[PDB]
Amino acid sequence: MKIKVALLDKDKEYLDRLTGVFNTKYADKLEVYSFTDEKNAIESVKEYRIDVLIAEEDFNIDKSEFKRNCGLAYFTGTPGIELIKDEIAICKYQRVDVIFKQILGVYSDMAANVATISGENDKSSVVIFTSPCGGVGTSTVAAACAIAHANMGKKVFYLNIEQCGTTDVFFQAEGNATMSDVIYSLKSRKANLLLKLESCIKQSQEGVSYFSSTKVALDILEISYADIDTLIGNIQGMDNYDEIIVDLPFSLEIEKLKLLSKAWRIIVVNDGSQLSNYKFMRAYESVVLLEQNDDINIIRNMNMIYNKFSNKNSEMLSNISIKTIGGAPRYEHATVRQIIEALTKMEFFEEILQ
């Protein structure tokens, strides 16, 4: 899929010069149409399905008239100017290769702004850990899984969307960028989104990629459901990760469940206690009822891990339609560090990959 580019200028010599170079030297990557009339350019966007329009800076382009996902940039003769009328400024007289790369940027930005979670086989798997059973170790098991899969050679991204999430207890890395910066970038309708997001990525000692915790916990209240969807879509859009592991607080809100339903697999953690088992089946019963909604399908994508399971005091749930893939005991007098180390040796984490 080549990028279709429209060029709008009164300098025909310039238009011919670019379209001539682009439709020969870059004909494998681009397909370029040129215009001297604004009305012809705008209606051609819709008709030819153009992905990037670049207009000369004196034009005032209303991008609502495109009637299509299509990026906008302005050509200029003025150096040192990053934006013109809120869009990327492209210097006419730099090297064509540099113009080309700016066009790719404008295309990328436009794609990144409407990214959404994908189930295509060439995108990262999205695995969401969640549980209605408090303190059963869901976050620890998710972190352990990320490490376990990193240990096997997977390129793993770890995303923690809890208000009081403990990302920084589990993973450490140099750098001052946090999830707060990620959120800011997603909310500012601003350019270079995907590069900004990539600059916030840290990498743990064991090779797990992640964003460190927001500077203060209340920051995460700023992220919407649309935003999480766009963020995960954008992480898949980076074409680097095998797997995205998301630690998501469980609840029965319809929008939470629609997000959950976009997971390739849902892993639920449970300790098999009386209150845990009861809580889970309370969740299960209402999920089933809510699966009457077209956009909600959850139970068929869930697998269960028992964690902190007492031989003497816990009991697995029977007669439910959720496969148990594994169990871990309750480690006595253990630190977080120790528990995670013990967990990463659990063979059942491989089952999440297949």
Ligand X SMILES: Nc1ncnc2c1ncn2[C@@H]1O[C@H](COP(=O)(O)OP(=O)(O)OP(=O)(O)O)[C@@H](O)[C@H]1O
Rule CB under 5 A: which residues touch Cl ion?
310-312
Q: In whole angstroms, give the CA distance from residue 322 to residue 266.
A: 11
Q: Name the strand (E) or helix (H) holding 168.
A: helix 167-170
- Which residue number is nearest to ligand X in terms of Cβ? 134
Q: Which 3 state secondary structure label does DSSP give 154? A: coil
Q: Is 278 in the site for a second copy (CB under 8 A)?
A: yes
Print burial letters for 232-262: b (CB count within 10 Å at least 16), e (below 16).
bbbbbbbeebebbbbbbbbeeeeebbbbbbb
Provide, rounded to whole angstroms, the least separation between the CB of residue 117 and a second copy. 24
Hey, what are 24's tokens? 């020969």
Contact map string, positions 322 to 341, toward ligand X, x by CB under 6 A: ------x-xx--x-x--x--
Shorter beta-carbon distance to ligand X: residue 81 or 217: 217
Nearer to a second copy, 188 or 286 (CB): 286
How many other C-beta atoms lie within 10 A of the C-beta of residue 293?
A: 12
Task: Residue 312: name its binding partner from ligand X, Mg ion, Cl ion, none (Cβ under 5 to 8 Å by kind).
Answer: Cl ion
Listed residue (209, 208, 191) closest to 200, CA to CA: 209
Considering only 77, 119, 135, 175, the residue that binds ligand X (CB under 6 A) is 135
> What are 156's two structure tokens?
């793993």
Does 295 bind a second copy (CB under 8 A)? Our answer is no
Which position among 137, 233, 326, 327 is part of the footprint of ligand X (CB under 6 A)? 137
Cβ closest to a second copy, residue 1 vs residue 164: 164
The count of residues interacting with a second copy (CB under 8 A) is 37
Backbone angles phi, psi at 271, to 5 degrees: -100, -5
Rounded Cα–Cα distance for residues 219 and 196 (Å): 18
Distance in angstroms (rounded) separating the CA atoms of residues 270 and 283: 12
270 belongs to the binding site for Mg ion (CB under 5 A): no
Q: Which amino acid is at 326?
A: G
Q: 250 to 309, contacts with ligand X by CB under 6 A? A: 273, 275, 307-308
- Show the binding pattern over residues 219-238: x = contacts a second copy (CB under 8 A), - = does not: --x-----------------
Which parts of this chain interact with a second copy (CB under 8 A)? 132-136, 139-140, 163-164, 166, 169, 213, 216-218, 221, 251-253, 274-275, 278-280, 282-283, 285-286, 289-290, 310, 312-313, 333-336
